[model samples]
Target: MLSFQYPDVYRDETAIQDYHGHKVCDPYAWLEDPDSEQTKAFVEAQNKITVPFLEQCPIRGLYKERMTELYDYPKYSCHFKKGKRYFYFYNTGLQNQRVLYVQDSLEGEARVFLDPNILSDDGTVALRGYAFSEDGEYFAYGLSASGSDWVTIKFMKVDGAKELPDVLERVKFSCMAWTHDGKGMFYNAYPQQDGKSDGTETSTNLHQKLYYHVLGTDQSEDILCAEFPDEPKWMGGAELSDDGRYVLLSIREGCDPVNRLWYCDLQQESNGITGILKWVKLIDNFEGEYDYVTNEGTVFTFKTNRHSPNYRLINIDFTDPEESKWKVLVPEHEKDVLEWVACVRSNFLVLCYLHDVKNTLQLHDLATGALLKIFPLEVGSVVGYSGQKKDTEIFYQFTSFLSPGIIYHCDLTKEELEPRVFREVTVKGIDASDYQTVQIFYPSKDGTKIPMFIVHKKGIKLDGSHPAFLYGYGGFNISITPNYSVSRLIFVRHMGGVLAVANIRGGGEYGETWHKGGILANKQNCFDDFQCAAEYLIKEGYTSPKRLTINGGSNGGLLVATCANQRPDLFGCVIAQVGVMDMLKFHKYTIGHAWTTDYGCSDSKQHFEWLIKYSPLHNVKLPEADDIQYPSMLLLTADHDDRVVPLHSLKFIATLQYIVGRSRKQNNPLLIHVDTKAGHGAGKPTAKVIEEVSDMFAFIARCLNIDWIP
Candidate 1:
């Protein structure tokens, strides 16, 4: 049995009162330093800790050796076909972003289809578009560079013996969808204009319009599908039906949470011109919609949340645009989670559903609405499934925390699943089954149920004597699903420590409404929900405040920081990775204006007041004589983090140090780690992963007074 401790925990009322009255300094002032040694040291230490962990992890080796065997690792994108082959492109990682290699399938090896510099000398090379012709004779490809936001479409004859330089560059295109006969293609581009006088001294609002490109003739014209004024809206890529009669358009206005879907009838309005096009609305107010599938004229199935927390498959008939014709094939009442819906056969759909964090693949008959089969996976496994026809073979990738990712081909018609082993990751002598995982739901402050996953050694007791590390990212409508982690399994689980992930309100687990409930002015819900989760763990004999540690990265880092400030008594330590601390003036930095969609801009007095009310830097309370306990906090940021800006963390650390130093109480030590070369999340390579896990473990060990194994 596990020993539990739940001693009386109370906030220092006097300290809160005194700290609340003090004048708050500008949290961003420290960023004005031209060359601060503190910033440099922070960056060096972050890299030193994250790099080694990535190297030791088994998945990295597997990804390098096996992943490249099937799909190229630096490969642009890949889509597999049943009896034929898989199509893929490659990225050279250069300013002239060119597609150097193109492969037919993931069978033996890749073939070089195009050279690095096949186009213009404008120093911009990007893979615009590529698709096989209906008869599989000619191939259409698109390319453009990063200097401009537009992409140009091109065509190539695959059967010809023409060298790479003989490739045809037809027209400059933005987005493309091929017709069924391969005679022409439909693409979209924004109308070129010069707007030098916007409030921010740049183009404010620009609208994108669709166009048609003919293969044999110079017939290209614009097609107005949808328009929005005052706000910039983009034609977010379109998909043509198998017959190429209808084109599905997913459009988004700026960064608004809502997206609308429209369909254009290409066969009816075929004057080979753009302005005469006619379109119809398919789905309206599509919040959190992605991965759509259509089978000619019969039906269209897509992943949407018109009803529930998770995405479900819904089939609609294009003939009738009535709401009653929209049938929910995969009912929300049947399961709490569903994602990744793809058409396998003419009438069957295959999807994966999550029961907590564990995932299982299921095949459903679209016509009868019946579950045909369920594929079970072993513990510590991650799988990706893709298939075309019902009777055809299905391909998938499977791996686990201790094992390397493996690609497998499953033939549903033959009832055979063949494991295609590419590479294996060996970590000395370690058994994966030693760790235990438990799924539980804890009640939040608002009576909302938040799911949590707890992983530890099988023999670990229910007694709360062990140290607990809780991780969460409850923002941006991002779902926290199951993923295999070798380092985390080896260190945290094997070390007899508890690792927990909280599915809080701000995450997409419960859909868009759940995310909105904890964002902007309602952001306090995120902090309160996390605090409740921590307290619930303590109350349920999981762990005491002395052994509890909380951590988050990016938006999640903001959550952990706010929670620490609100209820520091619930945690022994906290780690904020690239956290947004100075919420009041976040828009003053680069790309900060873009986040106004998620975190409302503080330019408004109401928003500013609400932001300052809970801004971590402004709300840091000083310890009183009778209440001097607070958790030690580690603020991690990257100097090149142009997204969140390093200034947020730098200023918060400086303020904490100054305020704590001035107080005559036991000041909690504030540690800052910054990575110079890495941007935002730090894109350094495998070594960074090792360093991150090691530093995190070290921080936990130091706070909990336990010796951790490297």
Candidate 2:
């Protein structure tokens, strides 16, 4: 075991605040300032100790070499069509970023249309979002640096893949929507800041406005299309109607599953989009999530959960735009949650649903709202799918715990609509037959039956001698479905570790009921669910406490940290990445207000009570018994992670060290890994990913006292 000499962090005892008449101490509040020299020094000093700890691991180099070998495999995304050309993202084995390829037809030769790797030397520049003009003549894409939420919108001509001079700056949380005229586009952006917009700053982002930029015009000349100055927290994107008659704006105040739907008629004005357009509020309340599927004249089809929490498709005519007037098109299933709906072949809807944590694809008649065909699927997830209202064909990619991925295409014109495999990804040194995945329903603390997927080598005995890895994200109504992970598969194979993904509450696994069961006042249920998952593994003799490692990122990161504090002896190691540790101040940061949908604002009395009970930073304590201690923890965060911010991890580690690591009971190492040019794990380069995976596994192996299989 590695003994840790944690860097001394000055804790200002006076850094305390009152929450609803209760005084709370925030001793490491200084770390919240990302750009301060003190914060930089702390991060450097922590890395000084952490770097050597991981480097000193004799298996670190071997872990990286094996990870590189296992990761050298081609990956492809589902093919989408723009006008007459088909496009898809392709990553040829360890490319820093996926390249967009275009083809004249399905059988035509594919060529690189946009390569993000060429944009940055270190692969830090990533393509964030992209859309084609109405006629597909112009392609607009957003580029973000250092994995930041901020992006610069740029345009390119479809013909010869020529770059355009037009560029939109200060864009964040935006969507590119092309008008029918194809003369301009709509996007969202925050007001231009004074300096240092490279994403290292932790300033609160506010006052986002949607603007329209005409072709060949500067960003300054763009017209303000939508802005909610009164509601500074409100952020949304523009979506044009399929018929091009109206521009739909889905507005959200927070990261709740609900949003307000507003729309503007493009043809309603004589000089279309010349001024700030007047919007008619469709669904003015945050009652439920209403996503635009398609529209025919004044009649609009939307996939919503206004009353049905499982979600369903409903049609509403703008002339009588009342909740009572909305007609149920496709009724919600009793068990399955409708995940997504795509219009294809002019009159058909390709619908994907989450049934017991597995994805199911189906086809239905658009006008009749009748289920036409149910597509067969393995116990896997539909990672990607692309189809348009006018297309006669659609493609989707499916992946599972053992399988890498399979890209399949279906000809809608055919009577059977049978899916044909287009590409089956085969890893270089991995065999699917050697591994097995099983889904079992485990009981949580509340007697809730939570589904958990367990994967390991085929026919492995449950002798309780194996190392087990548990992962979970039980908030934000996001479902934790099964997907292929090179790092996870490698752990199961080389380390003889069992991988478990718990579809805990606060997720859409069963629907909004399951989600609501784990948020706000119900948030502790998520922690309970995750802990029970680990307990189930132990009870079933899959692994013991010291042999188990728990991991989570973002909100999932919050999970591991909380569990570490609440049940220190539950697992052997903890890996929390970009976690929101300080519940009281989380809403004050960038885009954190949006998360209040799931994690209620601490500004309120009841919310403050709920937050203080389980907040990781506030709840960490020394072990109650001398025999037990907090697990070896690796708190991972990045400098550019404005979404969660590095301060969450920085402050968390400081608090953990002060309260727990300073004691003699804590013999295991407590380290934090801070990546320099990385953010909250979006659009990260493959090299950085491999490095992280290798170091993390090496840490896990060292802590668990396991040796590599090879």
TM-score attained by model 2: 0.99
User: Model 2 segments beyond 4 Å from truth?
Assistant: none
**What would the per-residue lDDT of candidate 2 be over residues 1-710, giving only the tens digit for each residue?**
65558898898999878888899998889998887899999999999999888888778898888888888898899988888898889998989999999999889999999999998898999999988987777899999999999899999999899998999999899979999889899999898666577788877888999999998988889999888899998887899999888999999888778899999988787677877787898888888889999988899999998888899999999999877888899999999899999998889999999988899999999898999988888989999998888789999899998888998989999988798898897786778888888889988887889999998887878889999999999998899898889888888878888999999999888888998999999899999999999999999989999999999999999999999999999889998888999998898887788888888989999999999999998898998898999999999889999899888889889988888888877888889989988899999999999989888888898888788888
Q: What is the C-alpha RMSD of each candidate to the true structure, in Å?
A: 9.0, 1.1
lDDT (Cα, tens digit) per residue for candidate 1, span 617-672: 78777655357555877777654455566767766766665555345453444566
The 0-to-1 C-alpha lDDT of every candidate, in the order given, reads 0.59, 0.90
Model 2: residue 151 alpha-carbon error in angstroms: 0.2
